[PDB]
């Protein structure tokens, strides 16, 4: 029994031999890009809005929330942390070594940094799914629909837009007309089974794991690193604090991931 290590040299020793590296990322890695984690939007946190019940009973409020985040995000750029992860992958790929990013984030900032082996387990801010036809589609339009123009203001006290359901984003496929929702996995919903099998495949065979800027309170993502760790495979935690999963782990590196990751992945 002992506190987790704070030794960068010890971690780097493993990093040089690792052939299969898994990087699990949460909101923290993008909060360093000026990305608002949720952390309040008006009077609510993300867990109260990222729910099919919220959407069923006030879809306009939910769409305002997601509209705000889409518009804010578009003009955000990848940071040193995202970059270090991307460049690490690219460099190791030429050595025949695999680096894979499993992200709880829906901001696609890993995609913008150039990450190739990316598992977006909660979907994307910039994808829609039709609640009628089920079709999934990319959508970076600003604003996603006319009625949301100038809406989504985040200040407590801001009045609900109360957009009629017909004027929320609607499907344009084969004249469907169905109500669109964010293609994001919400609390109470299942992650994509196909994505989960791929996640399991990487976890079951990696020889090094990094869990990066995640609170590890969202399930089942929170169980990913401990699973790797329970194989005895070393796990390194990069955060501005400790987590409920921390003491399972080998290392804890305190501080911004923009500082600690470029060093660790050099």
């Amino acid at each position: 029994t002992a506190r987790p290590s704070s030794s960068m040299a010890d971690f780097r020793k493993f990093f040089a031999k690792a052939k299969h590296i898994v990087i699990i990322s949460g909101a923290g890695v993008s909060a360093e890009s000026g990305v608002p984690t949720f952390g309040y939007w008006r009077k609510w946190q993300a867990q109260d809005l990222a729910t099919p019940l919220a959407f069923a009973h006030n879809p306009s409020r939910v769409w305002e929330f997601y509209h705000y985040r889409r518009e804010v995000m578009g003009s955000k750029e990848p940071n040193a942390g995202h970059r270090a992860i991307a460049e690490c992958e690219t460099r190791l790929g030429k050595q025949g070594r695999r680096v894979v990013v499993i992200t709880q984030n829906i901001d696609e900032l890993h995609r913008k940094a150039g990450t190739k082996n990316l598992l977006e387990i909660h979907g994307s801010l910039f994808k829609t799914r039709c609640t009628s036809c089920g079709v999934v589609a990319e959508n970076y339009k600003s604003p996603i629909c006319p009625a949301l123009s100038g809406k989504g203001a985040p200040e407590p006290g801001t009045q609900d837009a109360s957009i009629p359901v017909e004027k929320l984003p609607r499907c344009e496929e084969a004249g469907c007309g169905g109500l669109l929702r964010p293609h994001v996995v919400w609390f109470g919903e299942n992650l994509d089974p196909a994505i989960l099998e791929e996640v399991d495949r990487e976890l079951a065979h990696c020889d090094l794991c990094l869990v990066v800027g995640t609170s590890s309170v969202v399930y089942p993502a929170a169980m990913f690193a401990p699973q790797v760790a329970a194989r005895g495979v070393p796990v390194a935690e990069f955060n501005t604090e400790t987590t409920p999963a921390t003491n399972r782990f080998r290392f804890h590196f305190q501080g911004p991931c923009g500082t600690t990751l470029p060093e660790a992945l050099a």
Binding site: V217, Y219, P220
Partner: peptide
């Protein structure tokens, strides 16, 4: 286990 939860 596939269920997204806070708990």
């Amino acid at each position: 286990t596939a269920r997204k939860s806070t708990g």
